[PDB]
Design a binder for this molecule. Structure first.
Ligand SMILES: *[C@@H]1O[C@H](CO)[C@@H](O[C@@H]2O[C@H](CO)[C@@H](O)[C@H](O)[C@H]2NC(C)=O)[C@H](O)[C@H]1NC(C)=O
Ligand SMILES: *[C@@H]1O[C@H](CO)[C@@H](O[C@@H]2O[C@H](CO)[C@@H](O)[C@H](O)[C@H]2NC(C)=O)[C@H](O)[C@H]1NC(C)=O
Ligand code: NAG
Lengths: 212, 259, 124, 211, 40
């Protein structure tokens, strides 16, 4: 019943602006403070500001006074946050949260990812990593944009001994790797395949790991 | 031109020509009930235009106390003057025997279906600071709040079983919101001058920088109060002991300043 | 500067109800201003500060209430400015506002009200 | 403006061990709350008004304190308690502490190191990436050194770490060395070197481009 | 039953005319026998 629905992930150019949404249901919207919270990747939580009842009743963090603007649309129970003049330091998850009856942030939206970057929608190159004695294999997924990608092994048949590593940023594109460990009775006499999916470019690829 | 009965509790009554600005008559009733002892107190006069029919009942140990005020504007209308079943159940206590403060809250059933559960906070710097029980008061369906340099008022009013239950509200258990309003009291040259007005940190649901101008005190002495308030205060008004009340509200830190 | 309250009493008022005031009183005292001592069975020396009841005459006869049509046309009644100070109220208890030997009250003897010593005994 | 220092930044706790997070306030705050976060998902209210448990928070969790000092205790550490915990003042600046990362303590485990040459297809495309997996190790502290024909190579190295595995409580790291095809082709010897407390000497994995 | 006696300590009866609880004179609901039933 009682919830905060945030709008989807955003890819935006540096210098551009972005406005993101928080739809409130299952309670009386205008009786409660909505707060906004920023979390940069691997970092903490910063309070951005609040809104109460509407656009004319707000408070900001001094740090975000020239960056964030908070609005509300009572007709649809929706809070908005605009972020202007974006740089890479604004790339973060942004959360809305209700300030509840006993004065803590009691209900949170799921978060909206804002990636600030100039890149375009690029499919990955997928590369097989072929090693003896007991067999680790890999798959290199290189030069894609945006996040995410999806990596499986033998269509999900292989699940144990799998490590999928977080993407790193390389020449404004993402690179990621995945290992799978298997018995050497199993590879290369049987077939081992990483399956890579990138929804953004409607690309799905299967790369057999062959012996060098 | 309106004329009202004017009765002290001792029963000495007479007719009273109402002054200008007093165009209602009031009867006020206090019942003090304790085991098999009732004391009824009745008081009558001309009163201000802003008055309404109101009631408040609360238990305080083995005591029950009931206030009612009835007002009318026709001419000696207060010269004259129910009680059957039990309707909405409410939590009750009161600060005169420390009952609220000490958590010795009791249950009370209202007598009219019109009455609601009330919680009123009156922090002044001879009214009780905390009252809980049955009744109907100006600002009722709902809740309203105000605080400034020397005052915290809060009134909560609701129509569901024991909805006035819980710990008592005190200003210190409401968080600073980040909103700042100017506080003052007095009049435009004495008390509410830019020299005497200062910034206070608004708390909890009170985020309106408020200014009420009216009259206070015996005669029509002009009075003014600035501070932090709920939305609901910015729409009567007995919470500041004032009469021809005029309220402006804005929702930006400092906006409250004598402009 | 009010608190018309007497004895052990504490004044409470309410601003939502025209600032009407009254007092919370100890168990042994009754009425708005704690003016009634509902425990005393005996009177003092002169009895000037006796409170509490005895509504009766030396020869068994009700006192007239100090707010009856009749007592309001006598010298001592409940509507005088010094009623509270003299214990004169909406009741028919014997008092002694002018200094006489014992407490007393007004008693109707046919067409006319008359002063009459009160049954209440002395503390001696 | 009230600073909140959370100590420690990271702690590894044994299952069954009593854990104490403290939150320090440069000035006095009447109420402090605590949030739990996993996988950068929404923070979950955990403990509000100092000591009150949010719905579904298990009884091994408590909170206490006042003024400038508050604590979160877990009386006996469980695996699902591994998370980031944030304190927060109840009032206006609504500032959050910098966070305590709570992990599961466990037996030292050495990295399983594998090195991979560039694939044929990446070479036909004009690039060259050498990849090193350092898998299933504990504690998280680890240094990887790349060597080309025996010399340390610092530039063009990208590293990436997993979170603590849910099942064996270890960590894993990927290290990738990216070069031009021509530079790759002008050298033979490629070496991945792991320095971990489980051994006094590095774990080395190399390959020769030629042989 | 119009007039009570049974125990005089049953409380506010949820659905009957005139009652015999402690506060019955506060609601002015009492049956007159209550005054001479469980008194002093
Ligand atoms: C009890 O009080 C509540 C408090 O306002 C009333 O709630 C309102 O009810 C109407 C429709 O019934 C709604 O349109 C209002 O918006 C409600 N206000 C709210 C939810 O705050 C309620 O109706 C009252 N009920 C009775 C029986 O009087
Ligand atoms: C503003 O406030 C003051 C006091 O609260 C007003 O009344 C003062 O009262 C005394 C005693 O009666 C006077 O003799 C003072 O001189 C009064 N002050 C003034 C301004 O004359 C004061 O008059 C109020 N001003 C207004 C605008 O009514
Ligand atoms: C207040 O109550 C009395 C009850 O008799 C009624 O006559 C009068 O109309 C009411 N006045 C208001 C303010 O509605």
């Amino acid at each position: 019943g009682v919830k905060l629905q945030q709008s989807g992930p955003e890819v935006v150019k540096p210098g551009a602006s972005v406005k993101i949404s928080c739809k409130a249901s299952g309670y009386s919207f205008t009786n409660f403070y909505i707060h906004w919270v920023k979390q940069r990747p691997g970092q903490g939580l910063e309070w951005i500001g609040w809104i109460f009842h509407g656009s004319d009743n707000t408070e900001y963090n001094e740090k975000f006074k020239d960056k964030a603007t908070l609005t509300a649309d009572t007709s649809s129970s929706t809070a908005y946050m605009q972020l202007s003049s974006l740089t890479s330091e604004d790339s973060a998850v942004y959360f809305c949260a209700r300030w509840g009856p006993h004065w803590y942030f009691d209900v949170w939206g799921q978060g909206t990812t804002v990636t600030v970057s100039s890149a375009k929608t690029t499919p990955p190159s997928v590369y097989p990593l072929a090693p003896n004695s007991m067999v680790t294999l890999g798959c290199l997924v290189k030069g894609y944009f945006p996040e995410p990608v999806t990596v499986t092994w033998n269509s999900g048949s292989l699940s144990s001994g799998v490590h999928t590593f977080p993407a790193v940023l390389q020449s404004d594109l993402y690179t990621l790797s995945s290992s799978v460990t298997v018995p050497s009775s199993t590879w290369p006499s049987e077939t081992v395949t990483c399956n890579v999916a990138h929804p953004a470019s409607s690309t799905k690829v299967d790369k057999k790991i062959a012996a060098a | 031109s309106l004329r009202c009965m004017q009765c002290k509790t001792n029963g000495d009554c007479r007719v009273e020509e109402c002054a200008l600005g007093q165009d209602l008559c009031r009867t006020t009733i206090v019942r003090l009930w304790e085991e098999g002892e009732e004391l009824e107190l009745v008081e009558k006069s001309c009163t201000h235009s802003e008055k309404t029919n109101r009631t408040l009942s609360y238990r305080t140990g083995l005591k029950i106390t009931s206030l009612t005020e009835v007002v009318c504007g026709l001419d000696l209308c207060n010269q004259g003057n129910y009680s059957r079943s039990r309707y909405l159940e409410c939590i009750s206590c009161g600060s005169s025997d420390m009952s609220c403060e000490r958590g010795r809250h009791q249950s009370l059933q209202c007598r009219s279906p019109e009455e609601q559960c009330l919680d009123v906070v009156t922090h002044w710097i001879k009214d009780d600071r905390h009252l809980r029980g049955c009744g109907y008061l100006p600002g009722c369906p709902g809740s309203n709040g105000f605080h400034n340099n020397d005052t915290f008022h809060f009134l909560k009013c609701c129509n569901t079983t024991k909805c006035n239950e819980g710990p008592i509200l005190e200003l210190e258990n409401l968080p600073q919101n980040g909103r700042q309003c100017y506080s003052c009291k007095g009049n435009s040259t004495h008390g509410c001058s830019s020299e005497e007005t200062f910034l206070i940190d608004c708390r909890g649901p009170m985020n309106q920088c408020l200014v009420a101008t009216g009259t206070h005190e015996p005669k029509n002495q002009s009075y003014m109060v600035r501070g932090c308030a709920t939305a609901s205060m910015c729409q009567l008004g007995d919470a500041f002991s004032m009469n021809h009340i005029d309220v402006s509200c804005c929702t930006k830190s400092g906006c409250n300043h004598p402009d | 500067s009010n608190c018309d309250c007497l004895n052990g009493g504490t004044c409470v008022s309410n601003k939502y109800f025209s600032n009407i005031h009254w007092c919370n009183c100890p168990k042994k005292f009754g009425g708005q201003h704690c003016e009634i001592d509902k425990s005393k069975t005996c009177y003092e020396g002169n009895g000037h500060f006796y409170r509490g009841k005895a509504s009766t005459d030396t020869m068994g006869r009700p006192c007239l209430p100090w707010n009856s049509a009749t007592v309001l046309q006598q010298t001592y009644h409940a509507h005088r400015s010094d009623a509270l100070q003299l214990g004169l109220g909406k009741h028919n208890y014997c008092r002694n506002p002018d200094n006489r030997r014992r407490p007393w009250c007004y008693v109707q003897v046919g067409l006319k009200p008359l002063v009459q010593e009160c049954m209440v005994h002395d503390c001696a | 403006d009230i600073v909140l220092t959370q100590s420690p930044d990271i702690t590894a706790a044994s299952l069954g061990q009593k854990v104490t997070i403290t939150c320090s306030a440069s000035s006095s705050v009447s109420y402090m709350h605590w949030y739990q976060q996993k996988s950068g998902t929404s923070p979950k209210p955990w403990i509000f008004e100092i000591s009150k448990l949010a719905s579904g928070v298990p009884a091994r969790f408590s909170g206490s304190g006042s003024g400038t000092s508050y604590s979160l205790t877990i009386s006996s550490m469980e695996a699902e308690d591994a998370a980031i915990y944030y304190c927060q003042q109840w009032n206006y600046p609504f500032t959050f502490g910098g966070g305590t990362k709570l992990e599961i303590k466990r037996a030292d485990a050495a990295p399983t190191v594998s090195i991979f040459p560039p694939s044929s297809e990446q070479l036909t495309s004009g690039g060259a990436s050498v990849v090193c997996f350092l898998n299933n190790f504990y504690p998280k502290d680890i240094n990887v050194k790349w060597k080309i024909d025996g010399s340390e190579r610092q530039n063009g190295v990208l590293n990436s770490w997993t979170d603590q595995d849910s099942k064996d409580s270890t960590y894993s790291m990927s290290s990738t060395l990216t070069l031009t095809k021509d530079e790759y082709e002008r050298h033979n010897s490629y070496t991945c070197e792991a320095t971990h407390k489980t051994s006094t000497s590095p774990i080395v994995k190399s390959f020769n481009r030629n042989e | 039953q119009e007039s009570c006696k049974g125990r005089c300590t049953e409380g506010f009866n949820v659905d009957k005319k005139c009652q015999c609880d402690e506060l019955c004179s506060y609601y002015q609901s009492c049956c007159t026998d209550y005054t001479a039933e469980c008194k002093p």
